[PDB]
Amino acid sequence: HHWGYGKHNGPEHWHKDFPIAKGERQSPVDIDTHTAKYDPSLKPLSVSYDQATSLRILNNGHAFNVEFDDSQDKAVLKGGPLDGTYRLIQFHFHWGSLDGQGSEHTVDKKKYAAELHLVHWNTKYGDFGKAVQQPDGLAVLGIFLKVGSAKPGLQKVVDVLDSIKTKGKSADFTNFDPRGLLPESLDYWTYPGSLTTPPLLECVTWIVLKEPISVSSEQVLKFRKLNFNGEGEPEELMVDNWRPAQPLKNRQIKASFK
Numbered sequence: 001h002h003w004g005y006g007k008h009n010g011p012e013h014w015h016k017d018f019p020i021a022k023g024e025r026q027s028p029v030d031i032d033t034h035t036a037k038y039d040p041s042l043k044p045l046s047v048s049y050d051q052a053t054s055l056r057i058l059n060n061g062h063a064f065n066v067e068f069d070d071s072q073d074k075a076v077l078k079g080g081p082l083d084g085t086y087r088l089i090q091f092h093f094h095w096g097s098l099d100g101q102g103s104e105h106t107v108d109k110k111k112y113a114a115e116l117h118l119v120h121w122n123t124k125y126g127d128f129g130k131a132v133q134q135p136d137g138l139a140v141l142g143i144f145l146k147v148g149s150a151k152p153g154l155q156k157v158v159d160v161l162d163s164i165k166t167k168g169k170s171a172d173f174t175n176f177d178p179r180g181l182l183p184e185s186l187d188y189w190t191y192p193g194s195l196t197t198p199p200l201l202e203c204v205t206w207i208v209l210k211e212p213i214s215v216s217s218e219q220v221l222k223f224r225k226l227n228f229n230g231e232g233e234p235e236e237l238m239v240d241n242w243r244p245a246q247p248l249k250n251r252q253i254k255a256s257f258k
C-alpha cells in the first residue's frame with residue numbers, strides 16, 4: 001500500500017508515511033501574481049544546457065524521468081535567485097486526465113495541462129542524495145504546458161513513450177537537447193519549497209517560469225497512454241500525477257519581472 005495518486009493512497013494520504021507533508025515550506029503553491037513581490041535585485045536566470053548529456057528515459061511508476069549525466073558541470077543552472085551552481089540530473093512532467101488540469105503550481109488559481117520540472121542539485125553537496133538533505137540542496141525549474149501548437153523539441157520524448165509504457169521500463173535516450181523545451185522568456189517567480197512527491201523534503205528553491213510552452217493535444221494524449229502499473233499487472237493509466245496547491249504559510253513569492 002505505497003503512495004500514489006488515488007482515492008486510497010493519493011496526496012491527501014501522504015502525511016501518514018511522510019509527516020513533513022504538513023510542514024512549513026511544502027510545494028506546490030498557488031502563485032498569486034498580484035501579491036508576488038518584484039525584487040529588482042533578482043538576477044537573470046542562467047541556463048547553460050549546451051553540453052547536456054541525456055542518458056536514459058525511465059518509467060518509475062509515478063512519472064517518466066529523462067536522466068542526464070551529472071558527473072560533471074555540463075548542464076547547469078545558476079544566477080536567478082541562486083548562489084552557486086546546480087547540476088541538471090533529470091526532468092519529468094506532471095499532467096492531467098483532461099487538458100483543464102495537470103499542473104502542480106497554479107497562477108491565480110489557473111491550472112495548466114501539465115508542468116515540466118527540471119531538477120538540479122547544488123554542487124556544494126557533491127551529489128543529489130546529499131543535496132536533498134539540505135535546505136538549499138535543489139533548484140527545480142518549473143515550466144507550464146498549455147495545449148495548442150506542437151512543441152517540436154518535445155517530440156523525441158513523446159515518440160519513445162510506447163517503449164516505457166509500464167513501471168520499471170527504461171530506454172536509452174541519448175543526445176536529447178533540453179533547450180528545446182524552454183519558452184522564449186526566462187522571467188520567473190521564485191520561493192522556497194519542497195519536493196512534490198514523497199519524501200516531500202523541504203530542500204527546493206523553486207524557479208517557475210511565467211511563460212508557458214505550448215504542446216499539441218496529440219503530444220499530451222501520448223503522456224496519458226503511459227501506465228502507473230508494471231507489465232502484466234492490471235492497467236491503470238498514468239494521469240493526474242499532480243499534487244494540489246499547499247498552504248503558503250509564512251512565505252513570500254518573489255518575481256523577477258513587473
Ligand SMILES: CCCSc1c(F)c(F)c(S(=O)(=O)NC)c(F)c1F
Pocket residue numbers: 063065089090092117119128138140194195196197198
Ligand atoms: C533519483 C533522481 C530522482 S530526482 C526527482 C524526482 F524523480 C521527482 F519526481 C521529483 S518531484 O517531487 O516529483 N517534482 C518536484 C523531484 F523533485 C526530484 F528531485
Ligand code: NA
Pocket residue numbers: 051
Ligand atoms: Na560535447
Ligand code: NA
Pocket residue numbers: 127128129
Ligand atoms: Na546521484
Ligand SMILES: [Zn+2]
Pocket residue numbers: 092093094117196
Ligand atoms: Zn515534479
